[PDB]
Design an enzyme around this catalytic site. Structure first.
Site, PDB file in Angstrom:
ATOM      1  N   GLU A 173     -26.368 -26.598  10.387  1.00 19.93           N
ATOM      2  CA  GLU A 173     -24.979 -27.002  10.218  1.00 19.93           C
ATOM      3  C   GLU A 173     -24.283 -26.136   9.199  1.00 19.93           C
ATOM      4  O   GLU A 173     -24.687 -26.115   8.038  1.00 19.93           O
ATOM      5  CB  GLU A 173     -24.923 -28.440   9.773  1.00 19.93           C
ATOM      6  CG  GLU A 173     -25.409 -29.396  10.790  1.00 19.93           C
ATOM      7  CD  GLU A 173     -25.404 -30.774  10.262  1.00 19.93           C
ATOM      8  OE1 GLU A 173     -26.313 -31.087   9.441  1.00 19.93           O
ATOM      9  OE2 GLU A 173     -24.488 -31.522  10.660  1.00 19.93           O
ATOM     10  N   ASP A 195     -26.021 -36.000   4.356  1.00 12.31           N
ATOM     11  CA  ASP A 195     -25.906 -35.363   5.682  1.00 12.31           C
ATOM     12  C   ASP A 195     -25.515 -36.366   6.781  1.00 12.31           C
ATOM     13  O   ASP A 195     -25.244 -35.964   7.928  1.00 12.31           O
ATOM     14  CB  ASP A 195     -27.185 -34.556   6.081  1.00 12.31           C
ATOM     15  CG  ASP A 195     -26.863 -33.325   7.022  1.00 12.31           C
ATOM     16  OD1 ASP A 195     -25.742 -33.316   7.582  1.00 12.31           O
ATOM     17  OD2 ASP A 195     -27.700 -32.384   7.195  1.00 12.31           O
ATOM     18  N   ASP A 235     -25.276 -27.663   5.886  1.00 12.55           N
ATOM     19  CA  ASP A 235     -26.520 -27.087   5.416  1.00 12.55           C
ATOM     20  C   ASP A 235     -26.363 -25.631   4.888  1.00 12.55           C
ATOM     21  O   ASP A 235     -27.224 -25.150   4.128  1.00 12.55           O
ATOM     22  CB  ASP A 235     -27.494 -27.093   6.584  1.00 12.55           C
ATOM     23  CG  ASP A 235     -27.720 -28.498   7.157  1.00 12.55           C
ATOM     24  OD1 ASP A 235     -27.706 -29.494   6.383  1.00 12.55           O
ATOM     25  OD2 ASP A 235     -27.941 -28.619   8.391  1.00 12.55           O
ATOM     26  N   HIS A 291     -28.123 -11.297   9.805  1.00 15.38           N
ATOM     27  CA  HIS A 291     -29.027 -10.650   8.822  1.00 15.38           C
ATOM     28  C   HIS A 291     -29.055 -11.475   7.543  1.00 15.38           C
ATOM     29  O   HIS A 291     -30.116 -11.920   7.086  1.00 15.38           O
ATOM     30  CB  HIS A 291     -28.544  -9.228   8.518  1.00 15.38           C
ATOM     31  CG  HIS A 291     -29.347  -8.483   7.491  1.00 15.38           C
ATOM     32  ND1 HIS A 291     -30.329  -7.577   7.827  1.00 15.38           N
ATOM     33  CD2 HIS A 291     -29.245  -8.436   6.135  1.00 15.38           C
ATOM     34  CE1 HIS A 291     -30.824  -7.038   6.719  1.00 15.38           C
ATOM     35  NE2 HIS A 291     -30.187  -7.549   5.676  1.00 15.38           N
ATOM     36  N   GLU A 292     -27.870 -11.730   7.010  1.00 10.88           N
ATOM     37  CA  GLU A 292     -27.750 -12.525   5.776  1.00 10.88           C
ATOM     38  C   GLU A 292     -28.292 -13.923   6.029  1.00 10.88           C
ATOM     39  O   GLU A 292     -29.010 -14.453   5.197  1.00 10.88           O
ATOM     40  CB  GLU A 292     -26.319 -12.602   5.260  1.00 10.88           C
ATOM     41  CG  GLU A 292     -25.556 -11.229   5.061  1.00 10.88           C
ATOM     42  CD  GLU A 292     -26.319 -10.154   4.274  1.00 10.88           C
ATOM     43  OE1 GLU A 292     -27.131 -10.505   3.389  1.00 10.88           O
ATOM     44  OE2 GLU A 292     -26.037  -8.931   4.514  1.00 10.88           O
ATOM     45  N   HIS A 307     -31.742 -13.756   5.477  1.00  5.72           N
ATOM     46  CA  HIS A 307     -32.216 -13.895   4.100  1.00  5.72           C
ATOM     47  C   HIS A 307     -32.366 -15.364   3.771  1.00  5.72           C
ATOM     48  O   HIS A 307     -33.442 -15.800   3.353  1.00  5.72           O
ATOM     49  CB  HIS A 307     -31.386 -13.128   3.083  1.00  5.72           C
ATOM     50  CG  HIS A 307     -31.616 -11.655   3.145  1.00  5.72           C
ATOM     51  ND1 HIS A 307     -32.872 -11.107   3.272  1.00  5.72           N
ATOM     52  CD2 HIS A 307     -30.753 -10.614   3.152  1.00  5.72           C
ATOM     53  CE1 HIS A 307     -32.779  -9.793   3.348  1.00  5.72           C
ATOM     54  NE2 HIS A 307     -31.503  -9.464   3.280  1.00  5.72           N
ATOM     55  N   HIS A 359     -36.542  -7.994   4.090  1.00  8.96           N
ATOM     56  CA  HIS A 359     -36.363  -6.785   4.856  1.00  8.96           C
ATOM     57  C   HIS A 359     -37.677  -6.303   5.410  1.00  8.96           C
ATOM     58  O   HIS A 359     -38.721  -6.435   4.777  1.00  8.96           O
ATOM     59  CB  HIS A 359     -35.788  -5.690   3.993  1.00  8.96           C
ATOM     60  CG  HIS A 359     -34.349  -5.891   3.653  1.00  8.96           C
ATOM     61  ND1 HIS A 359     -33.785  -5.365   2.518  1.00  8.96           N
ATOM     62  CD2 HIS A 359     -33.361  -6.552   4.296  1.00  8.96           C
ATOM     63  CE1 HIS A 359     -32.508  -5.687   2.472  1.00  8.96           C
ATOM     64  NE2 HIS A 359     -32.223  -6.407   3.542  1.00  8.96           N
ATOM     65  N   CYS A 415     -33.411 -30.225   5.969  1.00  7.42           N
ATOM     66  CA  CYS A 415     -32.014 -30.612   6.148  1.00  7.42           C
ATOM     67  C   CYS A 415     -31.475 -30.147   7.533  1.00  7.42           C
ATOM     68  O   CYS A 415     -30.408 -30.587   8.023  1.00  7.42           O
ATOM     69  CB  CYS A 415     -31.238 -30.053   4.984  1.00  7.42           C
ATOM     70  SG  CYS A 415     -31.044 -28.278   5.031  1.00  7.42           S
ATOM     71  N   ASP A 472     -31.324 -32.927  11.380  1.00 10.02           N
ATOM     72  CA  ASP A 472     -30.281 -33.774  11.934  1.00 10.02           C
ATOM     73  C   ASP A 472     -29.286 -32.999  12.790  1.00 10.02           C
ATOM     74  O   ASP A 472     -28.890 -31.875  12.474  1.00 10.02           O
ATOM     75  CB  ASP A 472     -29.539 -34.529  10.840  1.00 10.02           C
ATOM     76  CG  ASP A 472     -28.610 -33.648  10.051  1.00 10.02           C
ATOM     77  OD1 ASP A 472     -29.036 -32.545   9.619  1.00 10.02           O
ATOM     78  OD2 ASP A 472     -27.450 -34.073   9.857  1.00 10.02           O
TER      79      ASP A 472
HETATM   80  C1  LIG Z   1     -23.764  -4.420  10.896  1.00 14.40           C
HETATM   81  C2  LIG Z   1     -25.127  -4.582  11.410  1.00 14.40           C
HETATM   82  N1  LIG Z   1     -25.275  -4.290  12.700  1.00 14.40           N
HETATM   83  O1  LIG Z   1     -26.623  -4.494  12.982  1.00 14.40           O
HETATM   84  C3  LIG Z   1     -27.262  -4.927  11.854  1.00 14.40           C
HETATM   85  C4  LIG Z   1     -28.706  -5.214  11.991  1.00 14.40           C
HETATM   86  C5  LIG Z   1     -26.360  -5.003  10.808  1.00 14.40           C
HETATM   87  C6  LIG Z   1     -26.681  -5.463   9.411  1.00 14.40           C
HETATM   88  C7  LIG Z   1     -27.409  -4.426   8.569  1.00 14.40           C
HETATM   89  C8  LIG Z   1     -27.781  -4.877   7.166  1.00 14.40           C
HETATM   90  C9  LIG Z   1     -28.190  -3.624   6.410  1.00 14.40           C
HETATM   91  C10 LIG Z   1     -28.654  -3.987   5.026  1.00 14.40           C
HETATM   92  N2  LIG Z   1     -27.630  -4.769   4.292  1.00 14.40           N
HETATM   93  S1  LIG Z   1     -26.794  -3.836   3.156  1.00 14.40           S
HETATM   94  O2  LIG Z   1     -26.896  -2.452   3.570  1.00 14.40           O
HETATM   95  O3  LIG Z   1     -25.498  -4.444   2.932  1.00 14.40           O
HETATM   96  C11 LIG Z   1     -27.814  -3.986   1.672  1.00 14.40           C
HETATM   97  C12 LIG Z   1     -28.018  -5.334   0.956  1.00 14.40           C
HETATM   98  C13 LIG Z   1     -26.693  -5.819   0.463  1.00 14.40           C
HETATM   99  C14 LIG Z   1     -28.975  -5.119  -0.221  1.00 14.40           C
HETATM  100  C15 LIG Z   1     -29.294  -6.308  -1.149  1.00 14.40           C
HETATM  101  C16 LIG Z   1     -29.778  -5.826  -2.509  1.00 14.40           C
HETATM  102  C17 LIG Z   1     -30.347  -7.271  -0.689  1.00 14.40           C
HETATM  103  N3  LIG Z   1     -29.881  -8.497  -0.463  1.00 14.40           N
HETATM  104  C18 LIG Z   1     -30.762  -9.411  -0.076  1.00 14.40           C
HETATM  105  C19 LIG Z   1     -32.073  -9.071   0.085  1.00 14.40           C
HETATM  106  F1  LIG Z   1     -32.933 -10.000   0.481  1.00 14.40           F
HETATM  107  C20 LIG Z   1     -32.477  -7.779  -0.163  1.00 14.40           C
HETATM  108  N4  LIG Z   1     -31.610  -6.856  -0.567  1.00 14.40           N
HETATM  109  N5  LIG Z   1     -28.580  -6.356   1.834  1.00 14.40           N
HETATM  110  O4  LIG Z   1     -29.820  -6.109   2.441  1.00 14.40           O
HETATM  111  C21 LIG Z   1     -28.079  -7.578   2.164  1.00 14.40           C
HETATM  112  O5  LIG Z   1     -28.657  -8.340   2.923  1.00 14.40           O
HETATM  113  C22 LIG Z   1     -26.805  -5.801   4.997  1.00 14.40           C
HETATM  114  C23 LIG Z   1     -26.604  -5.563   6.474  1.00 14.40           C
HETATM  115 NI    NI Z   2     -28.268 -30.724   8.499  1.00 13.23          NI
HETATM  116 ZN   LIG Z   3     -30.465  -7.496   3.572  1.00 11.62          ZN
END
Ligand SMILES: Cc1noc(C)c1CCC1CCN(S(=O)(=O)C[C@](C)(C[C@H](C)c2ncc(F)cn2)N(O)C=O)CC1
Ligand code: NI
Ligand SMILES: [Zn+2]
Ligand SMILES: [Mg+2]
Ligand SMILES: [Mg+2]
Ligand code: NA
Ligand code: NA
Ligand code: NI
Ligand code: NI
Ligand code: NI
Ligand code: NI
Ligand code: NI
Ligand code: NI
Ligand code: NI
Ligand code: NI
Length: 284
Positions: free
Chosen positions: A6, A89, A96, A146-147, A150, A156, A203, A206
């Site tokens: 969520e 929640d 979330d 990607h984020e 994380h 990575h 979390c 639900d």
């Molecule tokens: C557009 C696109 N199309 O297809 C894809 C696939 C993408 C995304 C590519 C990704 C490349 C790497 N990143 S980045 O280049 O912005 C670097 C950084 C900010 C480094 C930071 C330090 C960092 N944060 C957290 C960590 F766990 C480790 N390290 N990162 O990894 C952030 O998560 C972000 C984007």
């Molecule tokens: Ni939830």
């Molecule tokens: Zn990253």
């Protein structure tokens, strides 16, 4: 079993100004591509990204302070999103995770090549479960995933812990060519699995109450090549003057960031782009 992520989506004043009325459809279009990536079988888990809330900030002061320093924007955002989450929640608009989207170009200590930001392993911690995404166009859908990777405890794919198991997947340390046939690496697959087997999805169990419907058309359907170019290079940009690389205007001067046209993008009568290739809309 089935996990439901969520999510609150937040757009800053730069996004409101840039996108105008079309802003919410655009965020949902991003999030729907990200939602698809998380259903790809290579994640080896059942993960459903759902939107329970959307806030648009028309006045800086009503949102967090967004600066070019990415680490500080993330931190600003994390603090700020707390106050807007209902406690339990059971509430329908309780989230979330929260994602901020901004037009501002984000920077590390060293270059402004940062595309997004998040801490690792935070998904059911209400005060740390956040990400900031720089909007440089439709490819911000993959930044979003990607984020979110994380947030789900994925390092990575060059981390030493990934040696045993594995540059061409979602969790590459730098921008490179994704393998759209297998988006998530074995490492990503394992690190998310471990995390949930260790109890940290709690979390996510639900189901959402009346979630905001995500678009089920292809991102190229809402947004044609001229739109795509404008999302990257500003409203004065149009498509140049196919599919594999989107060129955009700037002696005709044209520019690219090397990304293919969004899937579903019209490339002629009865044809559209699918994974960088122009193909008949009707399939056999
Ligand atoms: C557009 C696109 N199309 O297809 C894809 C696939 C993408 C995304 C590519 C990704 C490349 C790497 N990143 S980045 O280049 O912005 C670097 C950084 C900010 C480094 C930071 C330090 C960092 N944060 C957290 C960590 F766990 C480790 N390290 N990162 O990894 C952030 O998560 C972000 C984007
Ligand atoms: Ni939830
Ligand atoms: Zn990253
Ligand atoms: Mg509120
Ligand atoms: Mg694709
Ligand atoms: Na940047
Ligand atoms: Na930049
Ligand atoms: Ni507005
Ligand atoms: Ni819509
Ligand atoms: Ni400011
Ligand atoms: Ni591989
Ligand atoms: Ni204008
Ligand atoms: Ni103009
Ligand atoms: Ni064209
Ligand atoms: Ni280039």
């Amino acid at each position: 079993s089935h996990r439901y992520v969520e999510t609150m989506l937040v757009a800053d004043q730069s996004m409101a100004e840039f996108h105008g009325s079309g802003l919410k459809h655009y965020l949902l279009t991003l999030f729907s591509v990200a939602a698809r990536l998380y259903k790809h079988p290579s994640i080896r888990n059942s993960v459903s990204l759902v939107v329970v809330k959307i806030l648009v900030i028309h006045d800086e002061q009503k949102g967090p302070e967004v600066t070019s320093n990415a680490a500080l924007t993330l931190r600003n955002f994390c603090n700020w999103q707390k106050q807007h989450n209902p406690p339990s929640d059971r509430d329908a608009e309780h989230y979330d995770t929260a994602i901020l989207f901004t037009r501002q170009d984000l920077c590390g200590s060293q270059t402004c090549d940062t595309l997004g930001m998040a801490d690792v392993g935070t998904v059911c911690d209400p005060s740390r479960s956040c990400s900031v995404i720089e909007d440089d166009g439709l490819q911000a859908a993959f930044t979003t995933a990607h984020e979110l990777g994380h947030v789900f405890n994925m390092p990575h794919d060059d981390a030493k812990q990934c040696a045993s198991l594995n540059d061409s997947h979602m969790m590459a340390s730098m921008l490179s060519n994704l393998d759209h046939s297998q988006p998530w690496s074995p490492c990503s697959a394992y690190m998310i699995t471990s995390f949930l087997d260790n109890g940290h999805g709690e979390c996510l169990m639900d189901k959402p109450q009346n979630p905001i419907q995500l678009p089920g058309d292809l991102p190229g359907t809402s947004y044609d090549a001229n739109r795509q170019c404008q999302f990257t290079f500003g409203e004065d940009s149009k498509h140049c003057p196919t599919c594999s690389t989107l060129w955009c205007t700037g002696v005709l001067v044209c520019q690219t960031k090397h990304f293919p046209w969004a899937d579903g993008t019209s490339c002629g009568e009865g044809k559209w782009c699918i994974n960088g290739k122009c193909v008949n809309k009707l399939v056999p």
